[PDB]
Amino acid sequence: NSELNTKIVNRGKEFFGSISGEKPSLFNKGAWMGKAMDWSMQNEQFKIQMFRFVDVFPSLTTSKLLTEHIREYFGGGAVLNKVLTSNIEEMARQFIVGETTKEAVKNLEKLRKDGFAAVVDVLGEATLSEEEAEVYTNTYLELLEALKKEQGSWKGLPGKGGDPGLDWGHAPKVNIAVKPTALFCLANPQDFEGSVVAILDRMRRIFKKVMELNGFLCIDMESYRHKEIILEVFRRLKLEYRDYPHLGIVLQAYLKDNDKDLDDLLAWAKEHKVQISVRLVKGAYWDYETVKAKQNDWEVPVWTIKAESDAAYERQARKILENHQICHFACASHNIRTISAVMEMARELNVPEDRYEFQVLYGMAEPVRKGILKVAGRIRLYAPYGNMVPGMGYLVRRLLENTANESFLRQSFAEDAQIERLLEDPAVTVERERAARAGLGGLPPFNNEAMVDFTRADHRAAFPKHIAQVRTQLGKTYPLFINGKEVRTNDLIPTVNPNKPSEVLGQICQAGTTEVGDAIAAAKAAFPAWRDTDPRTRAEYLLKAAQAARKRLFELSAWQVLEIGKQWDQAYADVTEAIDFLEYYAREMIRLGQPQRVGHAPGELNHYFYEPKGVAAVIAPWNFPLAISMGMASAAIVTGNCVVFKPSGITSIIGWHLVELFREAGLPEGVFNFTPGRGSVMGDYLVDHPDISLIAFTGSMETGLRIIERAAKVHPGQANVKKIISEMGGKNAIIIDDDADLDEAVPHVLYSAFGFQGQKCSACSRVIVLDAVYDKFIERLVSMAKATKVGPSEDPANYMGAVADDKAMKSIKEYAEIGKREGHVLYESPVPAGEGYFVPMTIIGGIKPEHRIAQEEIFGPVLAVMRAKDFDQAIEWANSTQFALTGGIFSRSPEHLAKARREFRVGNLYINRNNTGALVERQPFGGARMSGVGTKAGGPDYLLHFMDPRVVTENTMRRGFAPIEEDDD
Amino acid sequence: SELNTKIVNRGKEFFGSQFKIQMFRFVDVFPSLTTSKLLTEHIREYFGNEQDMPAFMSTGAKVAGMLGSFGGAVLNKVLTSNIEEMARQFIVGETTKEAVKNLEKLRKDGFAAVVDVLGEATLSEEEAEVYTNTYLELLEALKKEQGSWKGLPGKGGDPGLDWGHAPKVNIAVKPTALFCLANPQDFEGSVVAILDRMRRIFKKVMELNGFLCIDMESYRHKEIILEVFRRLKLEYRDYPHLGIVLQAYLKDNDKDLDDLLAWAKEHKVQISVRLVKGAYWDYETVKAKQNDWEVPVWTIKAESDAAYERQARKILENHQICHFACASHNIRTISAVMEMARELNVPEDRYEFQVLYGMAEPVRKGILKVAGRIRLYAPYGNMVPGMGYLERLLEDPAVTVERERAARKGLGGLPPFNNEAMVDFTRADHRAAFPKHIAQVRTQLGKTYPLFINGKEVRTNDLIPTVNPNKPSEVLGQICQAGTTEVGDAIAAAKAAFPAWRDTDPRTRAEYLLKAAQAARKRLFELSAWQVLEIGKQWDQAYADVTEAIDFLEYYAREMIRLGQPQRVGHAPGELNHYFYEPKGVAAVIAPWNFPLAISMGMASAAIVTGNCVVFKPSGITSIIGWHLVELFREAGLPEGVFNFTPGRGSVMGDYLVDHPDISLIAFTGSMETGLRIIERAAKVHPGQANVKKIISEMGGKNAIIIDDDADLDEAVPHVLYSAFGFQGQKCSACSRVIVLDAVYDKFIERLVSMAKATKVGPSEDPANYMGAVADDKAMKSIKEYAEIGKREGHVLYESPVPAGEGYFVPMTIIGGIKPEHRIAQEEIFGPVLAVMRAKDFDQAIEWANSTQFALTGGIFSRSPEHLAKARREFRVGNLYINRNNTGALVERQPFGGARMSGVGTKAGGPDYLLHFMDPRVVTENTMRRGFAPIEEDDDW
């Protein structure tokens, strides 16, 4: 509305005029803080180094660490140490009211004398243990106890009447904020109910004490990952205390979901006949959400045009004010436009002042704050307190917030103010900027398949449903598939659920040597026509197989949950990876499929091109039973070979999915043959066969090396020297440097070691921790481990579950016993009673390179902890096995990271994240040494391993004449 | 511009006085269509394109195809008749009787004549004799006729002469038609062979006081032909009727002309010159560019039109000593000669004009009415095959030149790769270089060649003499042999050198290869001469070995620079993935004797430049050439231990080297038997062994060339002879089976065997010899037994003489009747034993081509697009060559290697090769800290 907007602009103009020349303290260049922010706003490279240096600072406990990091980041001594320490502490102190409860209450009271209310927060988020969650909870209880004893002596902040005991006459004097992720270390929508209950139970304990002193509790909103969980905690706590009005929730206007979330919540309040309070903010995690989404192949949950967040805020604030009778409103913004909008919308709607207040962050926007105090009178400061390390996330969000290009505050106080532009109706700005914003073979470029996203109710509902549906399909007999036809044999092997082995999923026919011979012959007969099929047409078959899998994504995942004990996310990622291989290798064949002219001499034409080899034997593992199976089979297929495929005997139903997918794609008969069989009956037979030209194997070293020896022999009638593609496992280390962010390292190490019960060739089985941070890291690692539960993978509350089968359990348990003798147990989890191949989550310390569990691949949930004296020994220890598949390092030292990139010679080295989870294209996967033969699946050199090059050279000069070609010399 | 205006006007006077390509292709191939089936198939194929053809042709082609051979007879009758009639407009006859008759209708029209024989390329001594005797036969017929010939109208002189001064009988002769192996590589032998035949023809010419003119052919033979003319002139100084052709398009011509005139004056003789522009322009430019030779011709057409006038003038000036024939169809060129002569008052007995008999009759006559003395160049021979073989315009070309002249990339800072220039025996310095360097090598014999380990020479008590296979009494040197102890020391040195070398920047590693390449280039003739003596390489074979070694160095240097930069993969924000390559460790390089520098350097330098360290075992019979690698890397300053030289007895140290746990890669080129054994032993992982051993293996072939029934035999025969017998057949790429279609078989085998008969077997230091001794006594005994096996299996067609006395000589041997079931159709002989297989149809030819366990190279000669496309698809070898020999793969142009029992699919000299010596690594970094990440340019954002 033009009339309302005019009032808003005019108020905004009066506001700017009143603060003309004033700047927030943070930008004051008479202080280190101000100069650093100035430099950061001027130079992106410096900003990154500066903010990263702030993050690593608390770990720099020695003079050596401090001076070296300064040189590495930016390139008597005691006093210089304290100069630097004081500077960083100044940056942290900028945004906090204290370090202890006592100091906070004291400064809280000085703030009241200046006329400011407060919402008090205990710094902390993303907790790592139950014990840490308890400390955080008890800190709030301690705060409330101290506040209960002081508030009686507080005169209520000046207001226009009401109760002089209350702030402004109506607001409770005690107001606290709590971050839900500080309340549960395993908060995750994958375990939606368990997360809600764990957080709710601690929140209730805090809320009960709040209600004791008639105070206000506001629940902060954190990353999008937990948004739905947090709304549910609020709804549940609210209904438990339906008559208590002082409970609030943060809603984030920068979220696309927020128009609906706010509508849902207002309707919900009406339906349940309760009142609510909403602190409307834009949102604090924008940089994170954008990146996190793209990295994890989820949809971006925030608006990406800044004005869209402003417009949404004005929309949503208006909706709230219109509903002031049921919804109390806290306007939390430092933006003069946004603030003036709220003031004029409230005026127009005639909203009583007891229904809305203004909030700003402590240590920011002081001139804006001063204006609100003068004009509105009701201004509350978000006041956090605590130490630098638990407050580091918050601190960095403030540094980013105040220096961002799109920041209102930066544009008002760090740049020359363009007031007319700053005060524009953001809806108008959205229209303009939205307007302005507006591969080969015809194929769109490759993108990894969307990962399951348990923020979605439908994705959360899908798994229990598909798992149940799978259970309606048990008991079937799975035949061989040879030359386009189903072939039954008499020999059946049941396949069972490792988490509940009495549950039989199906019976699998076994191929004898005769049937495998029939499969090889069919592959061989099909080969000439398939070899002669256009590469683009072969690619099209893979694309059709991918679409078929895409249609069955949840169903395919559910099968893996039951047949091999994949957790929901592990199962889904297995299927999406199979899909990625199909899409990526289709495109790779299209690229490689066109002959290239080579040389540039006239009178001559040379073309270099590729052809397939013949029949490929594909021998797949059980641990990534669809992904790796499909990767090897489809690479061989798309390059023009025909395949005889032996799935693992314990994931043969998953192996059958390859049959179903290629059948739906309509692949020609003979090109793909499915011959599950007993290795003792047909393993050597398949590898030895004279008509095999390629073997693609992923498995243990022992088996891989045996195949490599047997395959080397050229038998009578054998056409080619057999090509080997082999991936043979690892004994992978993660190094924890002394400057590592332990809050990051702990959950990544835990996932690397115990994800899918440790049954990955990439799994971390050695964590090599520098002596200087050893006790601190191990305490935190063990504490998080203790909170995790072992049990059936179909139950998403469980972190890990049964290993693959009875033989694997016996082998892993024997290794666990060896390890317990070699070192000392640091943690050994309980397991469920009754049936299931359960091995405890096991962590063993005191391990050294000479120990068997530091050398031999266990392939189970047994983590060796190695205490290294310095970074040089960590590297040496990392390199001390015969394997070299993956590795990880947590370090914030450029020099150490460079040393690791050069010297930690593994196939896939990961810096500051888990060392599992390689994605197609992004992380081509595979290594050398005893871990493989240097082939990397999902990368641009892989398909060539399944082919051989040919050249055709033509003499184009006939009778002393040759046609000129465009690229001739 | 006095003469110019006068030239323009002499010219003005004169001026008043897809389907087409398919048609040309059809006439070309027509003489080969010897069956109705062949004829209908080629009509169907050549004129089948519905879109690009007239609908008459398009519809006829389809009809021809549907009728098949049943429709052939009527087509042959019609097409032959029409083509014979067409040919009659360019060729004066195919019998002497028919010739004379038209030569007389020509005299009775105002035209003199020069007669030339148009036939197939001379590929044998018999064919040279047929050509020669055809001239003798025309001269006898002309002798018996020129008496009754009324001399052409004139102004003075003998009226029993043409124009009163010109002999009535004039013949032109093509030099290379007199000697099928004419080659400047054997300059003197080529001169003598041709001269001996030219002399016999000339005497018959002098017997009837006629004129003999010696044609000029391609640049390859120019200096040979000039020397022939001289030797012949001095033999008959006083006989004035001998002529030579000079080509104005050659940059050499100015000096060649001046030198010839001088030479004449000095020896006090007269000469005659037929000045032409040049008939081989496209050939010369392509051949020069394929070999990095100097381009011998101008490349602006006007430059040739200008050079002609320059040179015609100079000739006319010296008319007292040099008679002159103007041979051009260019009005400006004829005009400008005319006036230049008449502006220097050259008597008319000193210049005549020559044009093609095939020139349009009105143009031919209207030109006579201005120039007066026109001689017709009159081709003579078989009509059908003969036809298969067949204003501003008046401006001063020098002006045109000044104007058109006036009107007129690599990475890593390095120029783009280009193959090292091949030796050029048209150069006197290149011809002189081999005898010199061979003699210099002979001053260096008798040395003891030590091991080279960790930068040091290491001697052992066990010495093996290396000898000349063409003269085994000649001992070139003694080679120290490494026992297992020394090989272990080499392996340990390599392993100790590896970490520092792996960490050496790829651009720096490449720099060492570039320095080794410059070092080899500096010693090219010397390095070549050594191979001539140590392994019996012929001059060109030796030089090509060294140039290929240089090419591997230059190419692999560039490949490592390309591959050495990590590449970001993926495009997710908050994340950096970099994909890059690392070396494996110690490489065993086990090299063959047959390309002793090229293959050795290729495998060694590839391993070295990729960051591996090398333990190198040369063949026991080419260890001095192996020592050259030591010299070259030493001169490049390669760090100690990176390259180690350990010749040793395979029986003593071969398995030890392959089996060693510290070896990570084995690069082998050699026999299948040895390669497969290496593959089996390398597969095993021994205690302490770090990697699964990587195999790079090339294991030989049983390579076929298919001769389709429409093949051009003038090209196919010599290419097959070279492919089979070049370097005594000792190549993994050699043609050991020639599979010949039934309809062309008898003609092909006659010409091939007759060519083989013309060649000589003997010492490879003698450039006159085609091939020489095989590698050693063991090879000789083995090859000879295979020959005896073959002779029992099939039918010997040719077995050459060999020199008496010492030397490992195997006869050049051709055996027919060979079928796929035969041992010599299956087993690699590696010597000069060629199996000839008669295939009943093209389908069978393909099936026979694919009938061995090998698949290295192949070749096909065909002019059928459908047969060629079938070969490209189904003749599945690593390197298939169409319409040329199947040997001589060049770096980059022909990356080399195959699969089946021929190799493991590695191709030396190509863009996938270096990757086989490395393993890939990925580093993945999470760049997000505390909720923010640096924005990268290549991010999806």
Ligand SMILES: Cc1cc2nc3c(=O)[nH]c(=O)nc-3n(C[C@H](O)[C@H](O)[C@H](O)COP(=O)(O)OP(=O)(O)OC[C@H]3O[C@@H](n4cnc5c(N)ncnc54)[C@H](O)[C@@H]3O)c2cc1C
């Ligand atoms: C008292 C208080 C409590 C808060 N509590 C929370 C909380 O519990 N949870 C939470 O997530 N946030 C919370 N916030 C908000 C957050 O911390 C920032 O303070 C706030 O987003 C800044 O907005 P603005 O109107 O002050 O400044 P502005 O400069 O107007 O707005 C900046 C905001 O715009 C958004 N933005 C930036 N770039 C883009 C873009 N390209 N596209 C779309 N949007 C963009 C971001 O949200 C950014 O913070 C709170 C804020 C206050 C004052």
Ligand SMILES: Cc1cc2nc3c(=O)[nH]c(=O)nc-3n(C[C@H](O)[C@H](O)[C@H](O)COP(=O)(O)OP(=O)(O)OC[C@H]3O[C@@H](n4cnc5c(N)ncnc54)[C@H](O)[C@@H]3O)c2cc1C
């Ligand atoms: C009677 C007679 C005898 C002959 N004898 C021989 C012989 O023994 N040896 C021999 O080699 N040929 C011989 N020729 C052919 C001669 O050399 C030329 O091929 C042809 O005659 C030139 O034709 P032109 O002067 O009529 O016409 P033009 O159009 O004037 O001349 C064409 C010529 O220009 C030259 N040319 C074309 N393009 C370029 C370019 N881009 N740069 C530089 N030069 C260029 C070529 O030589 C080409 O032949 C003979 C020709 C005749 C008529």
Ligand SMILES: [K+]
């Ligand atoms: K199972």
Ligand SMILES: [K+]
């Ligand atoms: K020798």
